[PDB]
Amino acid sequence: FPRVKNWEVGSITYDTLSAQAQQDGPCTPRRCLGSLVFPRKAPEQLLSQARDFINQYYSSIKRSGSQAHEQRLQEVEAEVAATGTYQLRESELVFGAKQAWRNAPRCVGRIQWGKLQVFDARDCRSAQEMFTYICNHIKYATNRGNLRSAITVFPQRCPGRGDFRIWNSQLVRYAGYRQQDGSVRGDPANVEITELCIQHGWTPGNGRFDVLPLLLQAPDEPPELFLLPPELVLEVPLEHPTLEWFAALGLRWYALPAVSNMLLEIGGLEFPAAPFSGWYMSTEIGTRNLCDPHRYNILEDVAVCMDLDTRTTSSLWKDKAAVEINVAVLHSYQLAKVTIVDHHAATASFMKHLENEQKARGGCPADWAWIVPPISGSLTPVFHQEMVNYFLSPAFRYQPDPW
Amino acid sequence: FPRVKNWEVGSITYDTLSAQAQQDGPCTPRRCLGSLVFPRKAPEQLLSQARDFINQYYSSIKRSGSQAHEQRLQEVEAEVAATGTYQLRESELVFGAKQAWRNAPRCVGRIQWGKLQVFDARDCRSAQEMFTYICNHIKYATNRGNLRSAITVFPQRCPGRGDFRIWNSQLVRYAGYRQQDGSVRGDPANVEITELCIQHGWTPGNGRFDVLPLLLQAPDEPPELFLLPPELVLEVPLEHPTLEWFAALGLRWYALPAVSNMLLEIGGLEFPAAPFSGWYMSTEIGTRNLCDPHRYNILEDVAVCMDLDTRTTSSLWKDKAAVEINVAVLHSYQLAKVTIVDHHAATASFMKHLENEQKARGGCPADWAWIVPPISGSLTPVFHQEMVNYFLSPAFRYQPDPW
Numbered sequence: 001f002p003r004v005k006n007w008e009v010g011s012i013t014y015d016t017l018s019a020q021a022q023q024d025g026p027c028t029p030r031r032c033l034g035s036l037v038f039p040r041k042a043p044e045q046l047l048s049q050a051r052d053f054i055n056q057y058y059s060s061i062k063r064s065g066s067q068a069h070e071q072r073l074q075e076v077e078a079e080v081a082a083t084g085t086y087q088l089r090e091s092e093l094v095f096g097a098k099q100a101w102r103n104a105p106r107c108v109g110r111i112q113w114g115k116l117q118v119f120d121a122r123d124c125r126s127a128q129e130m131f132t133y134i135c136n137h138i139k140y141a142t143n144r145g146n147l148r149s150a151i152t153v154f155p156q157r158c159p160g161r162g163d164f165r166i167w168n169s170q171l172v173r174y175a176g177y178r179q180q181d182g183s184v185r186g187d188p189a190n191v192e193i194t195e196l197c198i199q200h201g202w203t204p205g206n207g208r209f210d211v212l213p214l215l216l217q218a219p220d221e222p223p224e225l226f227l228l229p230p231e232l233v234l235e236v237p238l239e240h241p242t243l244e245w246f247a248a249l250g251l252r253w254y255a256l257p258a259v260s261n262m263l264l265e266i267g268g269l270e271f272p273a274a275p276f277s278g279w280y281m282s283t284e285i286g287t288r289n290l291c292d293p294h295r296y297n298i299l300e301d302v303a304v305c306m307d308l309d310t311r312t313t314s315s316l317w318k319d320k321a322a323v324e325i326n327v328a329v330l331h332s333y334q335l336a337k338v339t340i341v342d343h344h345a346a347t348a349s350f351m352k353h354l355e356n357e358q359k360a361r362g363g364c365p366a367d368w369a370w371i372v373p374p375i376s377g378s379l380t381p382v383f384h385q386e387m388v389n390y391f392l393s394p395a396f397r398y399q400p401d402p403w
Numbered sequence: 404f405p406r407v408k409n410w411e412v413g414s415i416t417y418d419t420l421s422a423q424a425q426q427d428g429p430c431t432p433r434r435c436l437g438s439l440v441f442p443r444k445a446p447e448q449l450l451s452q453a454r455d456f457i458n459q460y461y462s463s464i465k466r467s468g469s470q471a472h473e474q475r476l477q478e479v480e481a482e483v484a485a486t487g488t489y490q491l492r493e494s495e496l497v498f499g500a501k502q503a504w505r506n507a508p509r510c511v512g513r514i515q516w517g518k519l520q521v522f523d524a525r526d527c528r529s530a531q532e533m534f535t536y537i538c539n540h541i542k543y544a545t546n547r548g549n550l551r552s553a554i555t556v557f558p559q560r561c562p563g564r565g566d567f568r569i570w571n572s573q574l575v576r577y578a579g580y581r582q583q584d585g586s587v588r589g590d591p592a593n594v595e596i597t598e599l600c601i602q603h604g605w606t607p608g609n610g611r612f613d614v615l616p617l618l619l620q621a622p623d624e625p626p627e628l629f630l631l632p633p634e635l636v637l638e639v640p641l642e643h644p645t646l647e648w649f650a651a652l653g654l655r656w657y658a659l660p661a662v663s664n665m666l667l668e669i670g671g672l673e674f675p676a677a678p679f680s681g682w683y684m685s686t687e688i689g690t691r692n693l694c695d696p697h698r699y700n701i702l703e704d705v706a707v708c709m710d711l712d713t714r715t716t717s718s719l720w721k722d723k724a725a726v727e728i729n730v731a732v733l734h735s736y737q738l739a740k741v742t743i744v745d746h747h748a749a750t751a752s753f754m755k756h757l758e759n760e761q762k763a764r765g766g767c768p769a770d771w772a773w774i775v776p777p778i779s780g781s782l783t784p785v786f787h788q789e790m791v792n793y794f795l796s797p798a799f800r801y802q803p804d805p806w
């Protein structure tokens with residue numbers, strides 16, 4: 001049981017939950033690979049995962065060992081013997097989606113894990129129905145700016161049949177267009193998906209913030225292009241409370257972070273299409289998406305407008321510009337009445353989550369490099385908190401791109 | 404071998420050097436403990452470490468497999484067989500100290516590793532002579548503000564005789580006077596050594612920046628107290644280039660960071676007293692030493708003086724105040740003509756070091772959580788660089804406090 005110290009307060013806890021970690025991570029006693037973005041590259045197998053998930057479920061409602069518990073176990077055995085897979089009950093699906101969020105080591109927003117609206121799309125057939133489910137998800141989750149966490153679960157992977165897939169990494173993304181000079185207009189992160197939408201009959205734009213169409217794939221068909229109704233896509237124009245020229249930069253971002261390319265795993269079952277959404281932490285937009293060198297990379301543009309000395313690093317012009325961009329993001333979302341959390345509030349709430357999970361489960365899997373914000377790291381309490389990283393199931397996992 | 408990606412550029416390398424890591428870290432496939440501050444707490448074993456070190460030395464001078472190489476291996480074998488231990492050649496000590504710096508995974512300053520002045524104090528016989536060696540180190544390293552990297556190596560551990568130890572964690576440290584109510588005047592990081600200095604006869608001050616005396620331990624001797632000559636301790640008063648009231652805070656810091664409590668290990672030999680010094684990166688002073696809540700904790704006082712709204716996190720008052728404190732540190736050291744490096748220049752130079760080391764050795768041990776600076780993390784290139792952490796020897800290691 002690893003001993004874990006908070007260096008600000010000097011308090012000590014022991015992570016006993018890490019002993020339950022099912023899958024193996026990339027580290028060994030010889031070398032630590034904790035900084036890697038990607039840590040990883042039949043009925044007998046499925047059953048053991050399914051059994052252990054059912055046990056988790058009945059334990060969490062204080063009915064482990066019950067007659068209902070035995071009945072459910074024998075149902076999944078007969079299902080898998082007949083069909084090669086099995087079906088989750090509605091409450092098991094809800095429990096599993098929430099646990100997968102709860103177990104996500106890189107998520108700083110997990111204080112909210114018990115509040116998640118689960119939309120059951122497992123009856124879906126055809127991309128046209130997918131689009132309708134997705135549109136209802138966006139409508140519900142946006143809620144005129146009063147954002148609400150939600151997940152929509154499309155049919156599970158099964159033998160001899162293709163997957164439902166959302167090709168887009170998020171439900172809302174901005175196009176990125178290349179030119180002869182190899183540069184990108186728009187989001188460089190989305191160049192690949194932008195040319196895929198083009199290579200499927202989308203008329204591109206010429207803007208820095210053109211909302212991409214969706215490429216939805218029903219099993220064993222090619223993907224189909226769908227355009228999001230523009231009144232479903234809430235956007236926030238960015239302005240600054242005191243720097244009046246900031247608005248003239250024409251920056252904007254979208255309200256709803258809706259991740260659509262991860263795989264949800266519950267009880268050995270795999271849902272390759274299960275988009276989930278919550279709300280943004282301000283540094284995601286103001287520091288990463290707008291200031292990363294391989295994203296919009298606007299930091300020097302802002303610093304020039306601020307009349308800062310960009311010819312020496314020791315003026316900290318980068319740090320001053322970054323703070324004002326994050327201010328503009330917070331100010332703009334609050335003025336537009338769109339839910340947003342700043343990095344100080346979010347890390348404080350994660351510390352409370354760590355304390356709750358110590359009491360509830362004996363620990364909490366956490367990835368320090370992703371929990372600590374990308375600006376002002378040591379000014380937040382999570383910086384001073386030792387963390388144990390490990391993989392529990394149910395889980396959200398990376399998966400190969402469809403193409 | 405681990406594949407390692409730079410996400411800013413997209414470039415990929417393989418860390419083949421990690422396969423040579425001898426001593427084991429705390430991670431397993433089950434759980435990663437990379438964020439823990441303390442990862443770690445016989446003639447045949449000595450010979451294999453010595454042999455490996457001698458091989459490194461003769462490779463470094465392009466004389467591997469030479470007669471001199473084979474004769475030195477046999478010479479070390481003979482000495483170990485006769486005495487249970489052996490002595491380094493002067494050239495080996497210089498090389499080994501530079502290698503231990505080169506191997507230190509938490510050091511962002513390793514672009515400099517080949518420029519190190521090595522003072523051989525292995526003939527030291529008393530705490531008084533230890534003090535003379537230390538004063539000459541400080542004088543050389545400080546160089547009237549044009550700081551020069553240096554290490555002084557005191558005699559190695561040997562059986563039947565106690566260790567040389569410097570009890571202080573650095574050669575220059577400010578007193579921390581612990582109060583009644585758990586408050587502290589001065590540096591809370593130094594409460595323990597301050598109380599030990601008083602218990603050994605030091606007459607304490609009552610200021611916030613009182614330089615501590617040295618507690619120097621000769622073999623099998625109680626520690627002995629030595630006061631540093633004031634003219635040897637260069638200090639920098641802190642002012643801000645445009646906030647004139649900042650100088651009235653009365654803050655100062657010292658020029659020379661000189662770590663004195665780590666153990667230096669070379670070829671299986673152990674040097675428990677081997678203080679080393681370089682120069683500061685400005686975030687160590689401006690962000691950690693002055694803004695950590697458990698150190699000088701000046702953030703709120705500065706923010707209030709700046710007229711920031713400290714009642715709401717989303718004003719980013721903490722971020723704005725921390726930037727100006729870091730500006731003051733850099734401005735003050737530059738004005739005093741004392742060497743200092745900002746975190747943008749340091750991390751840029753560390754990226755150059757990684758490229759050099761990939762070519763030279765096929766990898767570089769690096770601790771991402773310590774390499775990324777405590778403010779403005781993703782504004783520096785190291786944030787976007789995957790890193791592999793592992794332990795090579797020669798090495799600097801933590802060791803228990805001698806009291």
Ligand code: HEM
Nearest residue numbers: 101104106107108109112149150276277278279280281396
């Ligand atoms: C409610 C507000 C939420 C906030 C403020 C939040 C915040 C964050 C942040 C800042 C990250 C790091 C992502 C990055 O840097 O790319 C993250 C990761 C993650 N979040 Fe949350 N999140 C929220 C809700 C949710 C929900 C509702 C789910 C799923 C039900 C979820 C699942 C995940 C997962 C799986 C990751 C890891 C993603 C990866 O490894 O790339 N989060 N979250």
Ligand code: HEM
Nearest residue numbers: 504507509510511512515552553679680681682683684799
């Ligand atoms: C020349 C300028 C140098 C700079 C700017 C520099 C910078 C740094 C910084 C910022 C850290 C992190 C320290 C912390 O956050 O507590 C560090 C760690 C370290 N440095 Fe360097 N350093 C320099 C020279 C040296 C030298 C000369 C040596 C030894 C010969 C050295 C050995 C180490 C070691 C062993 C660590 C790890 C300490 C630990 O694990 O607690 N550095 N350095």
Ligand SMILES: N=C(Nc1cccc(CCNCc2cccc(NC(=N)c3cncs3)c2)c1)c1cncs1
Nearest residue numbers: 037109189257258259276277278279280281284398
């Ligand atoms: N682009 C690449 N990099 C890449 C690879 C893996 C991961 C990532 C990071 C993208 N995380 C998006 C994300 C995930 C989870 C949370 C958030 N934030 C939020 N607040 C929420 C999103 N939903 C509800 S809350 C944002 C980037 C590629 C690599 N290989 C081909 S593409």
Ligand SMILES: N=C(Nc1cccc(CCNCc2cccc(NC(=N)c3cncs3)c2)c1)c1cncs1
Nearest residue numbers: 440441512592660661662679680681682683684687
């Ligand atoms: N309180 C504790 N703190 C604590 C524990 C472990 C580590 C640390 C960090 C100390 N790093 C000081 C340090 C080391 C190396 C480099 C630098 N910087 C520099 N630029 C230089 C110093 N020389 C040349 S360059 C600064 C602090 C305790 C631990 N266990 C019981 S208490």
Ligand SMILES: C[C@H](O)[C@H](O)[C@H]1CNc2nc(N)[nH]c(=O)c2N1
Nearest residue numbers: 035036037369370786787788789
């Ligand atoms: C190389 C490194 O692991 C990578 O850049 C990580 C670091 N920490 C992160 N932290 C968050 N929240 N999001 C990220 O994308 C990353 N990227």
Ligand SMILES: C[C@H](O)[C@H](O)[C@H]1CNc2nc(N)[nH]c(=O)c2N1
Nearest residue numbers: 383384385386438439440772773
């Ligand atoms: C818990 C965590 O490991 C600890 O606070 C570390 C994080 N990264 C650090 N990085 C540096 N350079 N110095 C530090 O003291 C720390 N502290």
Ligand SMILES: [Ca+2]
Nearest residue numbers: 482489490491
């Ligand atoms: Ca000899």
Ligand SMILES: [Cl-]
Nearest residue numbers: 257284285289
């Ligand atoms: Cl995003």
Ligand SMILES: [Cl-]
Nearest residue numbers: 660687688692
């Ligand atoms: Cl220090």
Ligand SMILES: [Gd]
Nearest residue numbers: 179180181182
């Ligand atoms: Gd061209």
Ligand SMILES: [Gd]
Nearest residue numbers: 304305306307
């Ligand atoms: Gd102007």
Ligand SMILES: [Gd]
Nearest residue numbers: 644645646647
């Ligand atoms: Gd002024």
Ligand SMILES: [Zn+2]
Nearest residue numbers: 027032430435
């Ligand atoms: Zn690890």
